[PDB]
Amino acid sequence: DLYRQSLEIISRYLREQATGAKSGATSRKALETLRRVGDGVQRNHETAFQGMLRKLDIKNEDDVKSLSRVMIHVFSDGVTNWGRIVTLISFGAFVAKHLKTINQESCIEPLAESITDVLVRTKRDWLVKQRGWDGFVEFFH
Ligand SMILES: CCCc1ccc(-c2ccc(O)c(C(=O)O)c2)cc1
């Protein structure tokens, strides 16, 4: 399933980003790709992400769910490309790091489920057309 596969990759990435500690072939290769591209993306948007995180004040699970409802509407507006999808997942990694920092580690998995919901609920057909995670891997390399 698209949702299950997406969640496996996204949860693994957010958790390893937060703790600093690390279809299996596709999932493995997508995670590796995401480690490489997500790194440049997080650094490129660092100040912006910090600013957004500040205003949002995400400190518990309810806040995570609250933010996801708004993200769904924003992400569904405008163009769709892999770079924007990586940007969404990178913001998720950024938030995940913040949650670990403030000792709210229990919120990381719900955040991963919310980021995956944002992605799959709004871009399911685009993802299927682009060949899912295999498409992702092929696109970057
Ligand atoms: C009140 C603001 C809540 C909010 C915060 C962040 C986002 C966000 C993050 C990364 C993204 O890549 C995109 C996007 O691509 O649209 C959108 C959307 C809404």
mmCIF file of N, CA and C and ligand atoms in Angstrom:
data_model
loop_
_atom_site.group_PDB
_atom_site.id
_atom_site.type_symbol
_atom_site.label_atom_id
_atom_site.label_comp_id
_atom_site.label_asym_id
_atom_site.label_seq_id
_atom_site.Cartn_x
_atom_site.Cartn_y
_atom_site.Cartn_z
ATOM 1 N N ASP A 1 0.841 -1.196 0.000
ATOM 2 C CA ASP A 1 0.000 0.000 0.000
ATOM 3 C C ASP A 1 0.873 1.242 0.000
ATOM 4 N N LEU A 2 0.404 2.242 -0.734
ATOM 5 C CA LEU A 2 1.108 3.513 -0.869
ATOM 6 C C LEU A 2 1.256 4.173 0.503
ATOM 7 N N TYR A 3 0.167 4.238 1.258
ATOM 8 C CA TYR A 3 0.237 4.892 2.579
ATOM 9 C C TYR A 3 1.229 4.177 3.496
ATOM 10 N N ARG A 4 1.123 2.851 3.603
ATOM 11 C CA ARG A 4 2.051 2.109 4.438
ATOM 12 C C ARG A 4 3.515 2.314 4.052
ATOM 13 N N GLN A 5 3.791 2.225 2.757
ATOM 14 C CA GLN A 5 5.171 2.386 2.296
ATOM 15 C C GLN A 5 5.687 3.805 2.623
ATOM 16 N N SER A 6 4.863 4.806 2.333
ATOM 17 C CA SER A 6 5.225 6.212 2.564
ATOM 18 C C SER A 6 5.523 6.420 4.063
ATOM 19 N N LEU A 7 4.644 5.907 4.928
ATOM 20 C CA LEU A 7 4.840 6.013 6.361
ATOM 21 C C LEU A 7 6.123 5.340 6.862
ATOM 22 N N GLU A 8 6.486 4.194 6.293
ATOM 23 C CA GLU A 8 7.710 3.499 6.706
ATOM 24 C C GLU A 8 8.942 4.392 6.472
ATOM 25 N N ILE A 9 8.996 4.992 5.300
ATOM 26 C CA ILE A 9 10.126 5.822 4.892
ATOM 27 C C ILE A 9 10.145 7.081 5.718
ATOM 28 N N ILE A 10 8.993 7.750 5.782
ATOM 29 C CA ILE A 10 8.882 9.033 6.516
ATOM 30 C C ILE A 10 9.140 8.873 8.002
ATOM 31 N N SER A 11 8.537 7.866 8.627
ATOM 32 C CA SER A 11 8.810 7.673 10.069
ATOM 33 C C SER A 11 10.260 7.356 10.327
ATOM 34 N N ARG A 12 10.868 6.489 9.508
ATOM 35 C CA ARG A 12 12.296 6.183 9.681
ATOM 36 C C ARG A 12 13.175 7.418 9.563
ATOM 37 N N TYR A 13 12.911 8.217 8.532
ATOM 38 C CA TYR A 13 13.674 9.451 8.350
ATOM 39 C C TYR A 13 13.515 10.462 9.501
ATOM 40 N N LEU A 14 12.287 10.683 9.958
ATOM 41 C CA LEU A 14 12.070 11.645 11.023
ATOM 42 C C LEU A 14 12.721 11.172 12.330
ATOM 43 N N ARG A 15 12.616 9.880 12.593
ATOM 44 C CA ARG A 15 13.211 9.356 13.820
ATOM 45 C C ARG A 15 14.739 9.427 13.824
ATOM 46 N N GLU A 16 15.363 9.024 12.712
ATOM 47 C CA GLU A 16 16.825 9.106 12.628
ATOM 48 C C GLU A 16 17.320 10.541 12.639
ATOM 49 N N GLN A 17 16.552 11.443 12.035
ATOM 50 C CA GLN A 17 16.917 12.866 12.087
ATOM 51 C C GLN A 17 16.868 13.412 13.515
ATOM 52 N N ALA A 18 15.807 13.072 14.239
ATOM 53 C CA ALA A 18 15.588 13.536 15.606
ATOM 54 C C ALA A 18 16.561 12.960 16.634
ATOM 55 N N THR A 19 16.860 11.677 16.531
ATOM 56 C CA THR A 19 17.722 11.006 17.514
ATOM 57 C C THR A 19 19.192 11.047 17.092
ATOM 58 N N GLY A 20 19.433 11.160 15.793
ATOM 59 C CA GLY A 20 20.783 11.190 15.258
ATOM 60 C C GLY A 20 21.277 9.777 15.035
ATOM 61 N N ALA A 21 20.379 8.817 15.223
ATOM 62 C CA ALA A 21 20.722 7.410 15.067
ATOM 63 C C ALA A 21 19.888 6.652 14.043
ATOM 64 N N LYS A 22 20.562 6.041 13.075
ATOM 65 C CA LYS A 22 19.871 5.204 12.096
ATOM 66 C C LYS A 22 19.352 3.966 12.826
ATOM 67 N N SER A 23 8.446 -4.290 0.267
ATOM 68 C CA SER A 23 9.180 -3.453 -0.680
ATOM 69 C C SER A 23 10.404 -2.824 -0.020
ATOM 70 N N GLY A 24 11.249 -3.678 0.567
ATOM 71 C CA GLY A 24 12.471 -3.295 1.261
ATOM 72 C C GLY A 24 13.549 -2.638 0.406
ATOM 73 N N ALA A 25 13.707 -3.090 -0.840
ATOM 74 C CA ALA A 25 14.719 -2.497 -1.708
ATOM 75 C C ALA A 25 14.337 -1.040 -2.011
ATOM 76 N N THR A 26 13.115 -0.847 -2.487
ATOM 77 C CA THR A 26 12.606 0.484 -2.793
ATOM 78 C C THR A 26 12.615 1.370 -1.561
ATOM 79 N N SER A 27 12.090 0.859 -0.457
ATOM 80 C CA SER A 27 12.058 1.618 0.778
ATOM 81 C C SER A 27 13.450 2.003 1.241
ATOM 82 N N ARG A 28 14.390 1.066 1.121
ATOM 83 C CA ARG A 28 15.756 1.330 1.539
ATOM 84 C C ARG A 28 16.386 2.405 0.672
ATOM 85 N N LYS A 29 16.236 2.256 -0.634
ATOM 86 C CA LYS A 29 16.817 3.207 -1.585
ATOM 87 C C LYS A 29 16.155 4.597 -1.474
ATOM 88 N N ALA A 30 14.867 4.626 -1.158
ATOM 89 C CA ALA A 30 14.151 5.921 -1.009
ATOM 90 C C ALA A 30 14.657 6.612 0.233
ATOM 91 N N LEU A 31 14.821 5.857 1.313
ATOM 92 C CA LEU A 31 15.371 6.439 2.521
ATOM 93 C C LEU A 31 16.767 6.987 2.244
ATOM 94 N N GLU A 32 17.601 6.241 1.534
ATOM 95 C CA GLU A 32 18.952 6.760 1.268
ATOM 96 C C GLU A 32 18.929 8.040 0.448
ATOM 97 N N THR A 33 18.037 8.080 -0.544
ATOM 98 C CA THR A 33 17.866 9.262 -1.408
ATOM 99 C C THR A 33 17.429 10.450 -0.560
ATOM 100 N N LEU A 34 16.448 10.189 0.297
ATOM 101 C CA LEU A 34 15.924 11.223 1.167
ATOM 102 C C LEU A 34 16.977 11.749 2.147
ATOM 103 N N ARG A 35 17.904 10.895 2.589
ATOM 104 C CA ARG A 35 18.992 11.378 3.425
ATOM 105 C C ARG A 35 19.863 12.383 2.658
ATOM 106 N N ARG A 36 20.164 12.072 1.406
ATOM 107 C CA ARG A 36 21.010 12.952 0.580
ATOM 108 C C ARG A 36 20.374 14.289 0.188
ATOM 109 N N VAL A 37 19.148 14.257 -0.338
ATOM 110 C CA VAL A 37 18.443 15.462 -0.814
ATOM 111 C C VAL A 37 17.851 16.313 0.319
ATOM 112 N N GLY A 38 17.299 15.640 1.328
ATOM 113 C CA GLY A 38 16.698 16.274 2.489
ATOM 114 C C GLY A 38 17.689 17.127 3.247
ATOM 115 N N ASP A 39 18.961 16.739 3.207
ATOM 116 C CA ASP A 39 20.020 17.477 3.907
ATOM 117 C C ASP A 39 20.204 18.862 3.301
ATOM 118 N N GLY A 40 20.325 18.937 1.979
ATOM 119 C CA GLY A 40 20.465 20.239 1.341
ATOM 120 C C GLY A 40 19.204 21.074 1.560
ATOM 121 N N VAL A 41 18.042 20.424 1.502
ATOM 122 C CA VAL A 41 16.773 21.138 1.620
ATOM 123 C C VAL A 41 16.566 21.745 3.022
ATOM 124 N N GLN A 42 16.907 20.986 4.053
ATOM 125 C CA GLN A 42 16.762 21.515 5.406
ATOM 126 C C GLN A 42 17.704 22.696 5.637
ATOM 127 N N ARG A 43 18.925 22.602 5.123
ATOM 128 C CA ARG A 43 19.856 23.703 5.342
ATOM 129 C C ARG A 43 19.388 24.902 4.550
ATOM 130 N N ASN A 44 18.923 24.660 3.334
ATOM 131 C CA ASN A 44 18.509 25.798 2.521
ATOM 132 C C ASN A 44 17.341 26.573 3.136
ATOM 133 N N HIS A 45 16.451 25.884 3.846
ATOM 134 C CA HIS A 45 15.255 26.534 4.424
ATOM 135 C C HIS A 45 15.325 26.727 5.938
ATOM 136 N N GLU A 46 16.516 26.604 6.507
ATOM 137 C CA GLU A 46 16.653 26.632 7.955
ATOM 138 C C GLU A 46 16.028 27.833 8.648
ATOM 139 N N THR A 47 16.417 29.026 8.232
ATOM 140 C CA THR A 47 15.900 30.224 8.919
ATOM 141 C C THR A 47 14.395 30.331 8.787
ATOM 142 N N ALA A 48 13.895 29.989 7.618
ATOM 143 C CA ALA A 48 12.425 30.044 7.381
ATOM 144 C C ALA A 48 11.752 29.028 8.286
ATOM 145 N N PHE A 49 12.259 27.790 8.289
ATOM 146 C CA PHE A 49 11.637 26.769 9.147
ATOM 147 C C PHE A 49 11.678 27.164 10.628
ATOM 148 N N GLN A 50 12.802 27.725 11.075
ATOM 149 C CA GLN A 50 12.901 28.138 12.470
ATOM 150 C C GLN A 50 11.812 29.140 12.814
ATOM 151 N N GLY A 51 11.657 30.136 11.942
ATOM 152 C CA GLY A 51 10.659 31.185 12.078
ATOM 153 C C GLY A 51 9.256 30.615 12.145
ATOM 154 N N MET A 52 8.947 29.665 11.258
ATOM 155 C CA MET A 52 7.611 29.073 11.248
ATOM 156 C C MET A 52 7.378 28.300 12.544
ATOM 157 N N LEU A 53 8.361 27.492 12.932
ATOM 158 C CA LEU A 53 8.246 26.709 14.168
ATOM 159 C C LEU A 53 7.956 27.593 15.381
ATOM 160 N N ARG A 54 8.670 28.701 15.494
ATOM 161 C CA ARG A 54 8.462 29.700 16.551
ATOM 162 C C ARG A 54 6.995 30.149 16.638
ATOM 163 N N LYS A 55 6.461 30.648 15.529
ATOM 164 C CA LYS A 55 5.091 31.143 15.538
ATOM 165 C C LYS A 55 4.102 30.042 15.868
ATOM 166 N N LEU A 56 4.367 28.826 15.400
ATOM 167 C CA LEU A 56 3.437 27.719 15.583
ATOM 168 C C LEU A 56 3.358 27.129 16.987
ATOM 169 N N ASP A 57 4.462 27.162 17.711
ATOM 170 C CA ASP A 57 4.459 26.629 19.075
ATOM 171 C C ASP A 57 3.848 25.228 19.141
ATOM 172 N N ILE A 58 4.569 24.248 18.616
ATOM 173 C CA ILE A 58 4.118 22.852 18.585
ATOM 174 C C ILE A 58 4.761 22.177 19.795
ATOM 175 N N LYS A 59 3.966 21.830 20.799
ATOM 176 C CA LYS A 59 4.547 21.290 22.030
ATOM 177 C C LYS A 59 3.910 20.019 22.531
ATOM 178 N N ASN A 60 2.932 19.520 21.795
ATOM 179 C CA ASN A 60 2.245 18.295 22.203
ATOM 180 C C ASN A 60 1.541 17.678 21.025
ATOM 181 N N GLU A 61 0.945 16.515 21.248
ATOM 182 C CA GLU A 61 0.289 15.775 20.187
ATOM 183 C C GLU A 61 -0.909 16.464 19.538
ATOM 184 N N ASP A 62 -1.711 17.154 20.347
ATOM 185 C CA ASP A 62 -2.866 17.864 19.811
ATOM 186 C C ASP A 62 -2.401 18.936 18.827
ATOM 187 N N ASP A 63 -1.318 19.624 19.173
ATOM 188 C CA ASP A 63 -0.772 20.688 18.312
ATOM 189 C C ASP A 63 -0.342 20.091 16.961
ATOM 190 N N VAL A 64 0.224 18.895 17.008
ATOM 191 C CA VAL A 64 0.665 18.218 15.782
ATOM 192 C C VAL A 64 -0.541 17.983 14.872
ATOM 193 N N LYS A 65 -1.608 17.433 15.447
ATOM 194 C CA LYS A 65 -2.822 17.204 14.697
ATOM 195 C C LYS A 65 -3.393 18.527 14.186
ATOM 196 N N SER A 66 -3.369 19.552 15.032
ATOM 197 C CA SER A 66 -3.887 20.872 14.646
ATOM 198 C C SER A 66 -3.133 21.453 13.436
ATOM 199 N N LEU A 67 -1.810 21.370 13.479
ATOM 200 C CA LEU A 67 -0.985 21.833 12.364
ATOM 201 C C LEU A 67 -1.232 21.024 11.086
ATOM 202 N N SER A 68 -1.401 19.713 11.200
ATOM 203 C CA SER A 68 -1.683 18.907 10.004
ATOM 204 C C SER A 68 -2.949 19.312 9.221
ATOM 205 N N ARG A 69 -3.989 19.716 9.939
ATOM 206 C CA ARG A 69 -5.241 20.126 9.277
ATOM 207 C C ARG A 69 -4.996 21.349 8.370
ATOM 208 N N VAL A 70 -4.188 22.280 8.851
ATOM 209 C CA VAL A 70 -3.842 23.468 8.064
ATOM 210 C C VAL A 70 -2.878 23.106 6.909
ATOM 211 N N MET A 71 -1.870 22.297 7.204
ATOM 212 C CA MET A 71 -0.924 21.868 6.161
ATOM 213 C C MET A 71 -1.583 21.175 4.979
ATOM 214 N N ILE A 72 -2.639 20.426 5.248
ATOM 215 C CA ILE A 72 -3.358 19.749 4.185
ATOM 216 C C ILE A 72 -3.870 20.741 3.128
ATOM 217 N N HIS A 73 -4.427 21.852 3.598
ATOM 218 C CA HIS A 73 -4.991 22.866 2.698
ATOM 219 C C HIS A 73 -3.898 23.583 1.933
ATOM 220 N N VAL A 74 -2.790 23.862 2.603
ATOM 221 C CA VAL A 74 -1.697 24.559 1.952
ATOM 222 C C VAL A 74 -1.022 23.656 0.926
ATOM 223 N N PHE A 75 -0.750 22.418 1.318
ATOM 224 C CA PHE A 75 -0.031 21.534 0.419
ATOM 225 C C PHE A 75 -0.843 21.195 -0.820
ATOM 226 N N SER A 76 -2.162 21.195 -0.689
ATOM 227 C CA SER A 76 -3.000 20.884 -1.834
ATOM 228 C C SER A 76 -3.115 22.031 -2.829
ATOM 229 N N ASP A 77 -2.683 23.229 -2.446
ATOM 230 C CA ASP A 77 -2.718 24.339 -3.376
ATOM 231 C C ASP A 77 -1.395 24.358 -4.173
ATOM 232 N N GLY A 78 -1.436 24.786 -5.429
ATOM 233 C CA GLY A 78 -0.218 24.952 -6.206
ATOM 234 C C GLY A 78 0.366 23.700 -6.860
ATOM 235 N N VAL A 79 1.541 23.851 -7.451
ATOM 236 C CA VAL A 79 2.179 22.764 -8.186
ATOM 237 C C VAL A 79 2.706 21.632 -7.308
ATOM 238 N N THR A 80 2.901 20.487 -7.946
ATOM 239 C CA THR A 80 3.409 19.297 -7.293
ATOM 240 C C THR A 80 4.650 18.803 -8.006
ATOM 241 N N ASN A 81 5.741 18.645 -7.258
ATOM 242 C CA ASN A 81 6.971 18.064 -7.800
ATOM 243 C C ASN A 81 7.714 17.395 -6.667
ATOM 244 N N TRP A 82 8.709 16.575 -7.003
ATOM 245 C CA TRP A 82 9.430 15.850 -5.963
ATOM 246 C C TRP A 82 10.142 16.810 -5.036
ATOM 247 N N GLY A 83 10.673 17.909 -5.562
ATOM 248 C CA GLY A 83 11.369 18.819 -4.675
ATOM 249 C C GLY A 83 10.433 19.364 -3.603
ATOM 250 N N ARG A 84 9.169 19.632 -3.945
ATOM 251 C CA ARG A 84 8.255 20.200 -2.939
ATOM 252 C C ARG A 84 7.920 19.111 -1.920
ATOM 253 N N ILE A 85 7.811 17.888 -2.408
ATOM 254 C CA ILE A 85 7.509 16.760 -1.517
ATOM 255 C C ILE A 85 8.683 16.587 -0.530
ATOM 256 N N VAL A 86 9.911 16.729 -1.018
ATOM 257 C CA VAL A 86 11.063 16.630 -0.104
ATOM 258 C C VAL A 86 11.046 17.783 0.893
ATOM 259 N N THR A 87 10.614 18.951 0.439
ATOM 260 C CA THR A 87 10.537 20.097 1.331
ATOM 261 C C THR A 87 9.531 19.835 2.445
ATOM 262 N N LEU A 88 8.378 19.237 2.121
ATOM 263 C CA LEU A 88 7.394 18.918 3.148
ATOM 264 C C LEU A 88 8.029 17.943 4.193
ATOM 265 N N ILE A 89 8.645 16.879 3.709
ATOM 266 C CA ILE A 89 9.235 15.859 4.596
ATOM 267 C C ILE A 89 10.391 16.446 5.417
ATOM 268 N N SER A 90 11.134 17.353 4.806
ATOM 269 C CA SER A 90 12.205 18.070 5.529
ATOM 270 C C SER A 90 11.667 18.972 6.638
ATOM 271 N N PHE A 91 10.546 19.659 6.396
ATOM 272 C CA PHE A 91 9.956 20.432 7.472
ATOM 273 C C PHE A 91 9.534 19.435 8.589
ATOM 274 N N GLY A 92 8.943 18.316 8.204
ATOM 275 C CA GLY A 92 8.611 17.274 9.187
ATOM 276 C C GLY A 92 9.861 16.855 9.996
ATOM 277 N N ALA A 93 11.002 16.684 9.338
ATOM 278 C CA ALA A 93 12.225 16.276 10.061
ATOM 279 C C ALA A 93 12.634 17.383 11.016
ATOM 280 N N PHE A 94 12.516 18.616 10.546
ATOM 281 C CA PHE A 94 12.844 19.787 11.377
ATOM 282 C C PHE A 94 11.994 19.834 12.648
ATOM 283 N N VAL A 95 10.691 19.617 12.498
ATOM 284 C CA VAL A 95 9.784 19.603 13.630
ATOM 285 C C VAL A 95 10.142 18.428 14.529
ATOM 286 N N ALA A 96 10.456 17.293 13.917
ATOM 287 C CA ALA A 96 10.817 16.097 14.705
ATOM 288 C C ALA A 96 12.037 16.374 15.601
ATOM 289 N N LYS A 97 13.038 17.068 15.068
ATOM 290 C CA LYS A 97 14.202 17.452 15.866
ATOM 291 C C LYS A 97 13.809 18.340 17.054
ATOM 292 N N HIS A 98 12.916 19.290 16.792
ATOM 293 C CA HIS A 98 12.397 20.204 17.816
ATOM 294 C C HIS A 98 11.656 19.422 18.910
ATOM 295 N N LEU A 99 10.844 18.443 18.504
ATOM 296 C CA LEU A 99 10.083 17.656 19.503
ATOM 297 C C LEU A 99 11.046 16.860 20.408
ATOM 298 N N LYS A 100 12.095 16.306 19.837
ATOM 299 C CA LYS A 100 13.046 15.558 20.671
ATOM 300 C C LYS A 100 13.722 16.537 21.635
ATOM 301 N N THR A 101 14.087 17.707 21.125
ATOM 302 C CA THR A 101 14.768 18.747 21.920
ATOM 303 C C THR A 101 13.969 19.165 23.174
ATOM 304 N N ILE A 102 12.663 19.300 23.022
ATOM 305 C CA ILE A 102 11.811 19.750 24.114
ATOM 306 C C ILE A 102 11.259 18.557 24.941
ATOM 307 N N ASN A 103 11.856 17.391 24.747
ATOM 308 C CA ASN A 103 11.488 16.176 25.483
ATOM 309 C C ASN A 103 10.051 15.769 25.224
ATOM 310 N N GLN A 104 9.665 15.815 23.952
ATOM 311 C CA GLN A 104 8.334 15.376 23.557
ATOM 312 C C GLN A 104 8.481 14.308 22.489
ATOM 313 N N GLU A 105 9.416 13.388 22.725
ATOM 314 C CA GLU A 105 9.728 12.305 21.785
ATOM 315 C C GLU A 105 8.484 11.502 21.388
ATOM 316 N N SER A 106 7.511 11.403 22.290
ATOM 317 C CA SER A 106 6.299 10.615 22.015
ATOM 318 C C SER A 106 5.500 11.216 20.865
ATOM 319 N N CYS A 107 5.812 12.464 20.512
ATOM 320 C CA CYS A 107 5.046 13.099 19.441
ATOM 321 C C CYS A 107 5.596 12.878 18.048
ATOM 322 N N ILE A 108 6.783 12.283 17.935
ATOM 323 C CA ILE A 108 7.451 12.100 16.661
ATOM 324 C C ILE A 108 6.700 11.146 15.756
ATOM 325 N N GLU A 109 6.265 10.010 16.292
ATOM 326 C CA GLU A 109 5.493 9.102 15.440
ATOM 327 C C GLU A 109 4.159 9.684 14.962
ATOM 328 N N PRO A 110 3.393 10.364 15.841
ATOM 329 C CA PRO A 110 2.152 11.002 15.382
ATOM 330 C C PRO A 110 2.477 12.063 14.291
ATOM 331 N N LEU A 111 3.579 12.787 14.447
ATOM 332 C CA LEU A 111 3.993 13.757 13.414
ATOM 333 C C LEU A 111 4.261 13.058 12.094
ATOM 334 N N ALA A 112 4.983 11.935 12.132
ATOM 335 C CA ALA A 112 5.224 11.199 10.901
ATOM 336 C C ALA A 112 3.919 10.772 10.255
ATOM 337 N N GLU A 113 2.954 10.336 11.056
ATOM 338 C CA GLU A 113 1.664 9.915 10.490
ATOM 339 C C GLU A 113 0.944 11.124 9.880
ATOM 340 N N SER A 114 1.032 12.274 10.552
ATOM 341 C CA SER A 114 0.440 13.513 10.003
ATOM 342 C C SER A 114 1.112 13.959 8.699
ATOM 343 N N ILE A 115 2.442 13.943 8.644
ATOM 344 C CA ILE A 115 3.141 14.333 7.393
ATOM 345 C C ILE A 115 2.766 13.368 6.251
ATOM 346 N N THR A 116 2.705 12.074 6.582
ATOM 347 C CA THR A 116 2.328 11.075 5.592
ATOM 348 C C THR A 116 0.883 11.311 5.140
ATOM 349 N N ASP A 117 0.010 11.699 6.062
ATOM 350 C CA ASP A 117 -1.393 11.964 5.720
ATOM 351 C C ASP A 117 -1.417 13.150 4.748
ATOM 352 N N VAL A 118 -0.705 14.229 5.085
ATOM 353 C CA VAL A 118 -0.685 15.419 4.229
ATOM 354 C C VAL A 118 -0.292 14.985 2.799
ATOM 355 N N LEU A 119 0.776 14.210 2.709
ATOM 356 C CA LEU A 119 1.311 13.811 1.421
ATOM 357 C C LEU A 119 0.366 12.939 0.637
ATOM 358 N N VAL A 120 -0.022 11.821 1.248
ATOM 359 C CA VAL A 120 -0.815 10.830 0.512
ATOM 360 C C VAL A 120 -2.263 11.241 0.264
ATOM 361 N N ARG A 121 -2.857 11.952 1.200
ATOM 362 C CA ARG A 121 -4.239 12.366 0.995
ATOM 363 C C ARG A 121 -4.390 13.393 -0.128
ATOM 364 N N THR A 122 -3.408 14.263 -0.284
ATOM 365 C CA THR A 122 -3.478 15.286 -1.305
ATOM 366 C C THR A 122 -2.826 14.903 -2.642
ATOM 367 N N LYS A 123 -1.836 14.014 -2.622
ATOM 368 C CA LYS A 123 -1.104 13.688 -3.849
ATOM 369 C C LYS A 123 -1.150 12.250 -4.301
ATOM 370 N N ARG A 124 -2.104 11.487 -3.788
ATOM 371 C CA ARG A 124 -2.186 10.084 -4.152
ATOM 372 C C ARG A 124 -2.080 9.810 -5.653
ATOM 373 N N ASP A 125 -2.936 10.430 -6.432
ATOM 374 C CA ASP A 125 -2.898 10.180 -7.867
ATOM 375 C C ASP A 125 -1.620 10.644 -8.550
ATOM 376 N N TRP A 126 -1.066 11.775 -8.123
ATOM 377 C CA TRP A 126 0.203 12.247 -8.671
ATOM 378 C C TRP A 126 1.293 11.227 -8.342
ATOM 379 N N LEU A 127 1.300 10.725 -7.106
ATOM 380 C CA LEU A 127 2.289 9.724 -6.681
ATOM 381 C C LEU A 127 2.176 8.439 -7.494
ATOM 382 N N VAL A 128 0.948 7.972 -7.675
ATOM 383 C CA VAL A 128 0.735 6.749 -8.461
ATOM 384 C C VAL A 128 1.220 6.955 -9.909
ATOM 385 N N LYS A 129 0.895 8.097 -10.496
ATOM 386 C CA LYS A 129 1.324 8.415 -11.869
ATOM 387 C C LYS A 129 2.839 8.491 -12.017
ATOM 388 N N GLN A 130 3.493 9.034 -10.995
ATOM 389 C CA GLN A 130 4.938 9.165 -10.994
ATOM 390 C C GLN A 130 5.640 7.897 -10.553
ATOM 391 N N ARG A 131 4.873 6.834 -10.381
ATOM 392 C CA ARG A 131 5.423 5.540 -9.987
ATOM 393 C C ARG A 131 5.868 5.401 -8.526
ATOM 394 N N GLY A 132 5.223 6.165 -7.647
ATOM 395 C CA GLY A 132 5.481 6.052 -6.224
ATOM 396 C C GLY A 132 6.929 6.250 -5.877
ATOM 397 N N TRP A 133 7.378 5.538 -4.843
ATOM 398 C CA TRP A 133 8.742 5.660 -4.351
ATOM 399 C C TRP A 133 9.816 5.179 -5.322
ATOM 400 N N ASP A 134 9.436 4.323 -6.273
ATOM 401 C CA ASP A 134 10.408 3.924 -7.279
ATOM 402 C C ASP A 134 10.674 5.136 -8.165
ATOM 403 N N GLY A 135 9.621 5.915 -8.412
ATOM 404 C CA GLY A 135 9.710 7.104 -9.252
ATOM 405 C C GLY A 135 10.654 8.083 -8.571
ATOM 406 N N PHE A 136 10.453 8.252 -7.271
ATOM 407 C CA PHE A 136 11.281 9.134 -6.455
ATOM 408 C C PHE A 136 12.751 8.766 -6.580
ATOM 409 N N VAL A 137 13.067 7.499 -6.341
ATOM 410 C CA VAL A 137 14.439 7.059 -6.450
ATOM 411 C C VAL A 137 15.007 7.331 -7.854
ATOM 412 N N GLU A 138 14.240 6.984 -8.883
ATOM 413 C CA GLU A 138 14.728 7.168 -10.274
ATOM 414 C C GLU A 138 14.946 8.634 -10.631
ATOM 415 N N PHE A 139 14.104 9.503 -10.087
ATOM 416 C CA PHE A 139 14.181 10.922 -10.363
ATOM 417 C C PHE A 139 15.495 11.538 -9.932
ATOM 418 N N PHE A 140 15.899 11.284 -8.686
ATOM 419 C CA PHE A 140 17.135 11.856 -8.167
ATOM 420 C C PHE A 140 18.400 11.117 -8.606
ATOM 421 N N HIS A 141 18.292 9.804 -8.797
ATOM 422 C CA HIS A 141 19.375 8.940 -9.286
ATOM 423 C C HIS A 141 19.043 7.446 -9.202
HETATM 424 C C1 LIG B 1 0.267 28.339 9.644
HETATM 425 C C2 LIG B 1 1.251 27.654 8.718
HETATM 426 C C3 LIG B 1 1.125 26.152 8.822
HETATM 427 C C4 LIG B 1 2.015 25.521 7.789
HETATM 428 C C5 LIG B 1 3.338 25.252 8.050
HETATM 429 C C6 LIG B 1 4.169 24.675 7.116
HETATM 430 C C7 LIG B 1 3.709 24.309 5.877
HETATM 431 C C8 LIG B 1 4.570 23.766 4.837
HETATM 432 C C9 LIG B 1 5.820 23.217 5.067
HETATM 433 C C10 LIG B 1 6.582 22.664 4.054
HETATM 434 C C11 LIG B 1 6.091 22.653 2.768
HETATM 435 O O1 LIG B 1 6.860 22.142 1.735
HETATM 436 C C12 LIG B 1 4.869 23.237 2.494
HETATM 437 C C13 LIG B 1 4.320 23.236 1.125
HETATM 438 O O2 LIG B 1 5.048 22.735 0.234
HETATM 439 O O3 LIG B 1 3.199 23.761 0.933
HETATM 440 C C14 LIG B 1 4.118 23.757 3.533
HETATM 441 C C15 LIG B 1 2.362 24.530 5.644
HETATM 442 C C16 LIG B 1 1.518 25.127 6.561
#
